Write a protein that binds this ligand. Sequence first.
Ligand SMILES: [Zn+2]
Ligand SMILES: [Zn+2]
Ligand SMILES: [Zn+2]
Ligand SMILES: [Zn+2]
Lengths: 109, 182, 66, 85, 160, 88, 319, 144
Amino acid sequence: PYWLYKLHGLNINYNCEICGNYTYRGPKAFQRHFAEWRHAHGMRCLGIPNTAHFANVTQIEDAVSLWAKLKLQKASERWQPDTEEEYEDSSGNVVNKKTYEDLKRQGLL
Amino acid sequence: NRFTVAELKQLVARPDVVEMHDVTAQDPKLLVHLKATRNSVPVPRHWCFKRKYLQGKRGIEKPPFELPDFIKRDIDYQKLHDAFFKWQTKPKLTIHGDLYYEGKEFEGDLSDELRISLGMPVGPNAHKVPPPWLIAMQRYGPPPSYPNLKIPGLNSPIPPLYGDVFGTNAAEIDRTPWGELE
Amino acid sequence: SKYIGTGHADTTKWEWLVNQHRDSYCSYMGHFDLLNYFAIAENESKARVRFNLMEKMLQPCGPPAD
Amino acid sequence: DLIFCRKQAGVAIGRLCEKCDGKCVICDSYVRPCTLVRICDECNYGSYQGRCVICGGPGVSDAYYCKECTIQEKDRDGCPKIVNL
Amino acid sequence: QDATVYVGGLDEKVSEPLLWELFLQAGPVVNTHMPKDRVTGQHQGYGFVEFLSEEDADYAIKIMNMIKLYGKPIRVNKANIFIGNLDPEIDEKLLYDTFSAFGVILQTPKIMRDPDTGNSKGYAFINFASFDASDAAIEAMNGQYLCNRPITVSYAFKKD
Amino acid sequence: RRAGRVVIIKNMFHPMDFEDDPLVLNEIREDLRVECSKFGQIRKLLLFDRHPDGVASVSFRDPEEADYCIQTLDGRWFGGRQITAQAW
Amino acid sequence: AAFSVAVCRFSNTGEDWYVLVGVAKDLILNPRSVAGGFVYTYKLVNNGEKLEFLHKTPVEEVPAAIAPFQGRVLIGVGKLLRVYDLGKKKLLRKCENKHIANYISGIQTIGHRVIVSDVQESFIWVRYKRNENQLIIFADDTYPRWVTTASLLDYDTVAGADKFGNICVVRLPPNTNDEVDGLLNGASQKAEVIMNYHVGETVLSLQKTTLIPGGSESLVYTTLSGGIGILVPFTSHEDHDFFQHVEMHLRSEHPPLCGRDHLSFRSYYFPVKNVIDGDLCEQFNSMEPNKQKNVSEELDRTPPEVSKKLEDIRTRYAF
Amino acid sequence: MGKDYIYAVTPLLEDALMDRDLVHRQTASAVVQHMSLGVYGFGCEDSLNHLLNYVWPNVFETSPHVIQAVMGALEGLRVAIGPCRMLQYCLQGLFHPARKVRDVYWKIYNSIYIGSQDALIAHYPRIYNDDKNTYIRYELDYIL
RNA sequence: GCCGGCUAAGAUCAAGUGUAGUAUCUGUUCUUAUCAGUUUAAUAUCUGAUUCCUCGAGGA
Ligand SMILES: [Zn+2]
Ligand SMILES: [Zn+2]
Ligand SMILES: [Zn+2]
Ligand SMILES: [Zn+2]
């Protein structure tokens, strides 16, 4: 059925560095490989989880840069009470509202 | 003079909506932005397929039509009309964005039948009739996965137990709706 | 195609956006209580807000590309 | 070549023949006629004065839009006379 | 496999939501799986319950062990003589201790397991020291009342 | 609904050839009938011997056979002249 | 420029009252630009007759909504929702959510939950976790709404208004789980729209109240053109059916004067849902006797009975 | 009169819309259109949105009768369900990379735009300014 | 459909039959190959160029 060979997408091969330069076949299989076991294994090597964000990304440095970006974004948009909080310790009790959540424990210890 | 997938993923606020062909659009930045609107269900997903929207597999051979329960329970007078409008229930409905596609059709308390088949008697008035899994809980201790569960004999009193209820979860306002018919 | 504001497979972002800006300004001119809202918000007479919208009608979203 | 006229409609009333009497001009329905049909001045002139808007035979009664076409404001386009080229 | 518990000894009254409802008191059972047969199209008595934590699976294995569910010896576990229709609640050491009363065992016995689940298939093979222990197992143990399961001991190979 | 079968052949013959040959017109009509019978059931076939462009009409029972005859007759040569075929 | 005001008491203080005023600093409207914002605090002494300045807390955006909440205060600082406690020199930030869409225009609280109004999105439901110190979004809507004002009807339902002249009622499904720790690029659970009505004028005030002594509760709204109106619930199916038939028959035999379709006008931006236009229904009393008889004889009734039935529901709630 | 009977025929229309036969889907679309235009102002939007979820995948159909019935059903749902939902269904396809998707979606969008051009003013999504052009509508951001 | 595959997964070019319309059947072929241009969301398509081995023959 040499006709299906070129109708279904074969004879067109794609490669991914995150996957041992493993060269994949026609696009229907290539798009599915990011969810398969081998790509998850390759991604664990860098320490980056497999999510929908890291799809159609085949190069290593692109993955690490996009991981830095996503890390910065998410870490920014959370609520971190340790550094984000306004305590006013009872040392003067009418001043010094610039105390963080850690300096207050040091002053109350 | 066209973006790559990883390059466009770096520019957009939401990279997980970017796809293979999205870099081949005439204006990919507007396309990805509209793909991220807080609504707007996506495209039917079979535009790129080559099987004319009807998959010839999955064993579609099945029963023709299952009528609702209200269907079964002159032909019927206004009393059976009363029955058809007392039994009428709302069916299962999908919300605004749940499009259909070829594949998505297939993918402390015990029942009386299981208690009758397991050989466990009914609950007495004032006695101790525990299940055989309760002796291990009385010997080893309460389960750490459900600390709020109560069992008769250990945490719940014997007179509790009523029918097939051999356990109760005890977790440690003005809820009336405003305008409703009387 | 004969109706103004319709699109097609070659419509650009600029044409779409100027079309919706233009019929937004016309809808503001039409509805009596939207113009009231704007004239109270920016502290102007309603005739002045109407004239400003008509003047903005000519080139909304700036001049086109290239 | 079944194309509507779609010109500015005037004060002339559309007419239907004995064969098309109950029909709606736009969707060909027979249920609930709702709105009286108006035609332009070039469709109502001289020999064209009284004629079926669907076929063009001698008119006998008024043409109407159906309630379904009236709800969708399809009576707001131009002259609905079927014209052949 | 660690968070999931393999249950063995399920009758026809037990079902896929019934095991999740019975295991809900032990822990948060997230999913239940029942492999269907190819000839009959029903469950073969062995299934799996995947919970959220491993402590809930350990409590379900320590609580629902050797229970009488639907008239069947249901038991949860961490996912030349032939003995058939044996209970899955017994282990290799338990079978070696039960076989030590009749005769002396040559080595540790082995029990067959399914290639999908791997908890219990239904048959086991045990070897005795001499033929007298095999004759005592075929006379006494072949038909003895085990833990809610009638076992059957037979000879694996015999020459006429 | 939907839309709700005659092929016209031109540049096939001339009236000047039938003035000195009374048997050429009947032979051309028989050749046109034998050509139209291979595409489908011909219900009516006429040839205008007084037309200067050589007009001929072939009416069949089905419009698909007339379309196939118009596709097979367009650009073909008949008697040394390029004849054209169109629908009706 | 002041945009929000609140009077409340703080738990860490005694029974003293305070006034909080939110102020924008160097606001431009078109194109929009602002330099910052401030929150003023006053002590409201002398039996509620005098304000005395206490301090002035800077914020990086226009504080548009201030609401007392459980002995503290919630403040919408542009896109941000914050909890604030009273301090000796300023207000102390305690909690914060950063996932509200565009701009907070209103905040309302019933004892457990917080309702947020977005300038372009309709409504966000939030829960405050008292022991974890967390503000979590657990529900939102599926429509864009330019909310002008909002009113709580009960623990699950909210009445909203719009810049374009619409009123809507939104209710949480009974499935709704409050204890949370997107499916449409939004929240996981959605809210259902149970009412839609076009008024024709921009509503800026909504309030549930009883107008006459010994009457029933109604929803009173207020409009930018100087109009006042109410929406009242039906208590039986018979009254609802009768008024529905009156509206149906009056839509045809007494059409609007300037050529508008009545059902199409009340469906200007969204289709009508569960509202009967009583301003069309009371036009029955001003028709001619022949058409009054033609209308009344279809409802199996006389014109005086229809008039009495129309007056009954009005005098039950309003004047 | 059909407002009391939409819940009873919904599973049958589901079944007919999942069918491979073309006449099945064409006639189910016709039913959806007549049902939509029949109930309007009576609060039956739940079942109609549910049925739109099954009608919409047929927009990529080449058969003329099926696509005609689908367009009729879409224009009936534009009245019964509202233009906001239709714009929400069209937004992601208006600027798709494939020309087929763009053609279909712009046809549907033009049909939605010619009827109820005024309502769409309140439904358009926010589009941010770029370096060259201003796209935010600032008047609607005013807060009295 | 059966336990990744057995070439019923697609396109195409000629002819026949037939309808108001959709269509139905036969021969086929399917580049097993490379580069450049057109084009397609990507394929596709189209437009051009490109001595050896075996037993007089065949294949590359
Ligand atoms: Zn890879
Ligand atoms: Zn009509
Ligand atoms: Zn006629
Ligand atoms: Zn005309």
